[PDB]
């Protein structure tokens with residue numbers, strides 16, 4: 127029927143003066159554009175078909191050509207930026223917005239998906255979608271008493287598009303737009319479908335990526351407890367964005383950080399710090415590094431929850447990137463912690479795995495480690511145990527690693543090494 131038409135025929139039919147010939151060629155185009163290996167998007171664009179497609183969006187009298195041209199356009203809009211641009215340039219954005227209120231759910235859904243791909247392309251288009259007024263009719267589609275009545279795929283599409291309106295930076299989305307979408311986002315975050323949950327979490331993790339004021343608008347809606355609950359999901363696609371949102375939040379103030387701790391976050395971290403998926407373990411250790419950068423009573427909760435031996439663990443054996451996150455966690459802990467907390471850290475076994483990392487050929491981790499070693503001696507000098515410490519470090523090959531660092535490209539490293547040898551050794 128409409129399968130494997132040539133571009134030339136599609137053009138011939140869409141140009142005819144026959145609504146039905148056009149409908150038939152438009153469907154042909156959509157099937158061509160829907161093929162999986164190398165769909166001829168640029169050939170379609172070159173033939174000048176986008177303006178014609180955009181006009182069919184307005185044919186309210188012919189519902190099926192609306193759907194078909196919507197789907198065709200959608201396929202193109204899901205390609206490169208240049209391709210997405212051609213769709214926007216054809217004037218698709220207000221036309222798609224008008225279709226959100228289509229009586230046919232298939233058509234309105236298709237518009238949702240298309241606005242999703244356009245906003246998702248980048249900041250400028252995101253903000254252009256918003257200016258043309260997309261947010262209200264998108265939100266209106268979710269104004270039902272119970273989200274469970276909505277079609278499963280329909281609801282996944284809306285959540286996904288909403289998350290693209292939250293998605294990029296430089297600039298971050300308009301404050302006024304974020305405040306408008308957030309209440310519905312809080313609600314989706316409570317909906318019982320794994321995909322809606324994942325997408326909602328991604329949205330929140332976009333909105334929490336930035337300055338503390340941004341973090342505050344989110345934290346103020348009270349989602350932190352639901353984020354922590356989702357942190358313990360079995361589904362890795364829910365846990366990955368939940369962990370990102372949580373990690374973003376603890377880069378903010380001490381008070382925003384305390385919210386995460388109070389919600390029970392720290393109880394999930396023994397799993398997260400030993401998680402078999404390498405990126406979850408990396409994210410969890412980074413998150414820990416921002417927590418040890420906080421208050422002394424916050425360091426104490428890390429301590430109280432038994433997470434210090436997990437940090438020793440990560441430092442001892444992990445992906446190198448995760449180990450560097452572990453280094454930062456320790457330098458932060460040591461610089462801001464009390465003497466008793468630094469003493470405990472050494473009692474848990476921090477020194478040897480710390481020294482083994484001096485071997486690493488990465489200049490900035492070495493300074494982080496040196497930074498941390500110094501902070502520990504400073505605790506020891508308050509207790510006059512600097513000597514006993516020296517021996518620990520010397521027993522586990524720590525000095526051979528420290529002495530070797532003078533013969534080193536960087537001399538902020540050599541100067542840090544230098545000082546340590548004189549001040550605390552013979």
Ligand SMILES: NCCCC[C@H](NC(=O)c1ccc(-c2cccnc2)cc1)C(N)=O
Nearest residue numbers: 412415416418419420450451454458461462
């Ligand atoms: N109370 C001691 C906190 C240490 C100082 C404090 N530093 C931090 O908060 C911090 C510094 C560095 C990092 C970090 C950097 C690179 C990778 N992973 C973590 C995370 C947090 C500051 N710049 O104000």
